Symmetry: C3
């Protein structure tokens, strides 16, 4: 019934997971230079993001319906799922930032 | 297969968000007296509740499918989304009770 | 587009609730010996598990779509719903492990 809501420059919020992934893509395809191209490819299609790291295998990162929201399948650290706590994404299993998991794993490759 | 469950005075639980909103409506349309009618209207239709506060703009409060459950769009403090912690509703972003956000904002109007 | 993901021995993850319930069933139908058969039956069909405890009434335990995931209806302690925290399931209301609720309630029967 109210109008003084839809004459605002109105907008559907983003999906909180969607926003993480897009920020990860340009953070990661930027890191897709600091390899001797031994982390050669990262692609994101429809909330599925694949990350080729030949040293370990291939990563798959998902948007997922909840008992939680972002799903990580690590060729190295295994599978894990994450939901928002205080505005960072966190393992339901134990509570670790996936930011940290990815961070560590990515840079364990740069060593090689 | 068991009967001694359905000869109980049986009942579908409520939606936890639904219960919050109904409690907010009579808490707020009661506060729709303690204004010099400068918070003139509050309506709740189908899990959408609008709150007119001319001083700031119009509030919209939603039931929402999860990465969390109650969605707040504040003409003043902006958007935010909330899920249950220990039986109160809490910003996924930072962890603040929306009870508090609403409380503060409502009474920042009573000042005027 | 990537193959070196689907020539892995691939697998859909389980539902975190599903895994809890299956572990509860054999933990409970094992306890369906340590009664003077006064906790005579426990059945699990399609993510609905019923538990007959004549002393108190019948329990129903559910897989549920979220503002949380496992739903408990206790003939004794009432209803409650639970989501993962740090890999254990926890009352949204107050934060107690349902493991504990069930544990206590089950063994309050063994007293009799
Ligand atoms: Co969480
Ligand atoms: Co929460
Ligand atoms: Co929780």
């Amino acid at each position: 019934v109210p109008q003084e809501v839809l004459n605002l420059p109105l907008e559907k919020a983003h999906e909180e997971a969607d926003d993480y992934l897009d920020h990860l893509l340009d953070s990661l395809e930027e890191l897709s230079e600091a390899h001797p191209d031994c982390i050669p490819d990262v692609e994101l299609s429809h909330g599925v993001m694949t990350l080729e790291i030949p040293a370990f295998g291939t990563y798959v990162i998902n948007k997922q319906p909840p008992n939680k929201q972002i799903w990580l399948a690590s060729p190295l650290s295994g599978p894990n799922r994450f939901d928002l706590l205080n505005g960072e994404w966190v393992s339901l299993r134990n509570g670790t930032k996936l930011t940290d998991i990815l961070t560590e794993e990515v840079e364990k490759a740069i060593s090689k």
